[PDB]
Amino acid sequence: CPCVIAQNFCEKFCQCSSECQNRFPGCRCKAQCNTKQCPCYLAVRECDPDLCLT
DNA sequence: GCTGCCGGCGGCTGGAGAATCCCGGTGCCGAGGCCGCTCAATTGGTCGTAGACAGCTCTAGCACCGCTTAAACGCAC
């Protein structure tokens, strides 16, 4: 999987399956997806507005 | 003396993962009516267990005295 060999996840535009484990879940955080807990914040990214519906 | 310096400290934050409530449908099983019959109630006689009274007399309590040893006291460790 090019995603895999790239040591990178799958983005919703990948052709990894709709359940391909190489995808990424998305922010769930409650107060702000901002502090040292929120997973997006760790694997430094911005919680996409399709996922962090929280 | 004080400079970092460093470690710990407790205090807090908030994610996370399970336990909680609610509601919406759904049955099978408590619950109730039914018929009946057999066993429980009614009537009636008895004689004997069981209650009395009147009993004897054994023994369980009270005491007393004198004994002694087991109890009580303390005591280093």
UniProtKB/Swiss-Prot annotation:
Location of the protein in the cell: Nucleus
PTM description: Phosphorylated by AKT1. Phosphorylation by AKT1 reduces methyltransferase activity.
Protein's job: Polycomb group (PcG) protein. Catalytic subunit of the PRC2/EED-EZH2 complex, which methylates 'Lys-9' (H3K9me) and 'Lys-27' (H3K27me) of histone H3, leading to transcriptional repression of the affected target gene. Able to mono-, di- and trimethylate 'Lys-27' of histone H3 to form H3K27me1, H3K27me2 and H3K27me3, respectively. Displays a preference for substrates with less methylation, loses activity when progressively more methyl groups are incorporated into H3K27, H3K27me0 > H3K27me1 > H3K27me2.
Name assigned to this protein: Histone-lysine N-methyltransferase EZH2
Residues of the full protein shown: 534 to 587 of 746
Subunit structure: Component of the PRC2/EED-EZH2 complex, which includes EED, EZH2, SUZ12, RBBP4 and RBBP7 and possibly AEBP2. The minimum components required for methyltransferase activity of the PRC2/EED-EZH2 complex are EED, EZH2 and SUZ12. The PRC2 complex may also interact with DNMT1, DNMT3A, DNMT3B and PHF1 via the EZH2 subunit and with SIRT1 via the SUZ12 subunit. Interacts with HDAC1 and HDAC2. Binds ATRX via the SET domain. Interacts with PRAME. Interacts with CDYL. Interacts with CLOCK, BMAL1 and CRY1. Interacts with DNMT3L; the interaction is direct.
Induction and repression of expression: Expression is induced by E2F1, E2F2 and E2F3. Expression is reduced in cells subject to numerous types of stress including UV-, IR- and bleomycin-induced DNA damage and by activation of p53/TP53.
Gene designation per UniProt: EZH2
Similarity remark: Belongs to the class V-like SAM-binding methyltransferase superfamily. Histone-lysine methyltransferase family. EZ subfamily.
Tissues/organs with expression: In the ovary, expressed in primordial follicles and oocytes and also in external follicle cells (at protein level). Expressed in many tissues. Overexpressed in numerous tumor types including carcinomas of the breast, colon, larynx, lymphoma and testis.
Disease entry from the Swiss-Prot or TrEMBL record: Weaver syndrome: A syndrome of accelerated growth and osseous maturation, unusual craniofacial appearance, hoarse and low-pitched cry, and hypertonia with camptodactyly. Distinguishing features of Weaver syndrome include broad forehead and face, ocular hypertelorism, prominent wide philtrum, micrognathia, deep horizontal chin groove, and deep-set nails. In addition, carpal bone development is advanced over the rest of the hand.
